[PDB]
Amino acid sequence: GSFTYTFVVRDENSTVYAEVAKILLASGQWKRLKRDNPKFNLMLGERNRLPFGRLGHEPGLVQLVNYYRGADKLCRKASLVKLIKTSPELTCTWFPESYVIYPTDEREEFRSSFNKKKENEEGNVWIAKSSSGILISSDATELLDFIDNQGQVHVIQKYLESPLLLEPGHRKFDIRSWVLVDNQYNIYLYREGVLRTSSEPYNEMFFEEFNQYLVTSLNINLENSILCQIKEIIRVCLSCLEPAISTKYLPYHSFQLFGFDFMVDKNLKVWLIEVNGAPACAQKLYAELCKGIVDLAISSVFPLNNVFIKL
Length: 311
Ligand SMILES: Nc1ncnc2c1ncn2[C@@H]1O[C@H](COP(=O)(O)OP(=O)(O)NP(=O)(O)O)[C@@H](O)[C@H]1O
Ligand SMILES: [Mg+2]
Ligand SMILES: [Mg+2]
Ligand SMILES: [Mg+2]
Fold this sequence. Notes:
- The protein is of the alpha+beta class.
- The chain is built from 8 helices and 16 strands.
- It folds into 3 domains: 1-66, Rossmann fold (3-Layer(aba) Sandwich), CATH 3.40.50; 67-96 and 162-311, ATP-grasp fold, B domain (D-amino Acid Aminotransferase, Chain A, domain 1, 2-Layer Sandwich), CATH 3.30.470.20; 97-161, ATP-grasp fold, A domain (Dna Ligase, domain 1, 2-Layer Sandwich).
- It has helices at 15-25, 72-75, 77-86, 107-119, 140-149, 207-213, 223-245, 286-298, and strands at residues 5-9, 30-32, 42-44, 64-65, 98-101, 126-130, 135-137, 154-158, 175-181, 187-190, 194-195, 205-206, 253-254, 256-264, 270-276, 308-310.
- Phosphoaminophosphonic acid-adenylate ester binds next to strand 6, strand 14 and strand 15.
- Monomer.
């Protein structure tokens, strides 16, 4: 329809959306405006503290923003924990046992869990992390100190003592998928992940080789084990969040890119450890990705004249 849409960029430092800001121009149908110009169709907003209250007011403007208000209820450690312990649906065998500790909480239920394991004489190594410096120990009282020492509401999570290692180099790793949730709440998983292998033994590795280390050194395949369970976790996590961030009755549209962080243990079991709301990408994939975003979440709303899986 030879029409030209408009957009503002409120986050100059996002490499994922500094990229998108381009691919748009590439279609010859988009024009970037002044960061403060309110006549935009699409707003590539800021990582945190985004002005959602001013969306869908400008007369006649249908607006889309690249963040779901309230999506931090899944992205912040402490929140993610409450969310899984709240909704009855969350059968969460894939989520490390976790407790929120306020410096000044669940440190009482934590101690109970800790002591129970101590008497049953089983793995009792935990890791204390900050919701937004990490400690890994077996001493509760000590872990709790660390928390109180530096006020910042930490989370005490059960540490995976039996992690699937790699080689050469026998190093620990973690996988990270990219999930795109559009304005109608369709979920799309980019066919490519990325691993963050460790330097010292127990570099960034892609699904290219890793799909091999699962066969040329193991039994099953990349799909028949990991990629299978990963989909289930994504689906339930976002399904439990929908009610609290659905834009069905809001005066504007919303879409968002999430970066899920997983881990695999000895028995090839996949655990969820974190979900990042403003994930960057590999310098390599930054292209086939940012184009799926425009295709699936932007152009789907503002029409112009495989790679993704729909969970
Ligand atoms: N439950 C767990 N069991 C085993 N290892 C874990 C667990 N949780 C986290 N880790 C490891 O701890 C590392 C850092 O934890 P993470 O929760 O990602 O912290 P962060 O605050 O986002 N910081 P960053 O190190 O920049 O990613 C991860 O890359 C994992 O290798
Ligand atoms: Mg929103
Ligand atoms: Mg996004
Ligand atoms: Mg992290």
